[PDB]
Symmetry: C3
Subunit: 113 residues, 3 copies
């Protein structure tokens, strides 16, 4: 398993950490949402949560990444939820498919469970 600390940022001003698909995968529109493996696992730094978002270059090529909320204490594998919009899309191993944004986790008094 690899932790979020092994992810890289493309440039210092980049909001997101790059997420790559560990497999070659073909997607068609009729398949609906598919969860792509990344080999990267939670959890997140204290007081943060994560959002998985698309890369614009990839969205413009017809692969939609559904925004995904990564809880602070999730310890499973971070997967990318994606769908081919209109056309057949092929994702090659190591292609950068999405990005992870880290955001502050605000405290509230809402009851738990």
């Amino acid at each position: 398993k690899q932790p979020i600390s092994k992810l890289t940022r493309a440039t210092p001003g980049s909001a997101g950490l790059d997420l790559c698909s560990t497999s070659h995968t073909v997607l068609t529109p009729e398949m609906g949402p598919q969860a792509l493996s990344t080999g990267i696992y939670g959890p997140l730094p204290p007081n943060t949560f994560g959002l998985i978002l698309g890369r614009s270059s990839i969205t413009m090529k017809g692969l939609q990444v559904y925004p995904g909320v990564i809880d602070n204490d999730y310890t499973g594998e971070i997967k990318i939820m994606a769908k081919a919009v209109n056309n057949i899309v092929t994702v090659s191993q190591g292609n950068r498919i999405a990005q992870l944004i880290l955001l502050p986790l605000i405290e509230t008094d809402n009851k738990v469970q």
Copy 2:
């Protein structure tokens, strides 16, 4: 009307507050976006705004929730904008359909109106 304070968090490390649909509703792809009632109303805690996002279990079952921005001072009913992706989806009363994330509302000098 019920306020956001009555929402619950599944676990202490959960980023989102659960939102449930108050009605049983059937959605098909050709229907396009539908606004699901929740019986929960703004406004939000000072200096925050809200984002409505999907639950990954629900997105993987073919119901897409369009990310929705909840303004700090909105006092209407928070509705979930959703679409069946490819298949017929049935939402039962009380099913958890989406989640509300609270985020800091940054001040800027942009002119207002």
Copy 3:
């Protein structure tokens, strides 16, 4: 070129800054994602990044805006990635199509490039 400082907020409690399309554009579902020009350019205020999100009134009328991450140091034109969901959609010049949300850019030790 116009900077983000020229954008306006609809009301003081509005989370987003309004983004308008500078052209008249017709979109159909089979076209897939389209990048709409706005004439607004990065970069963003220090320690922030941007998210492009839809307006709910517009999403409910069948135009989906794909959430887009605006990096802090991007100096190009901010474009709106959008898709007609099911029907033909016509966007007129000056119509408010999306909104820009500003969020804190959290520092991490992740390696760069």
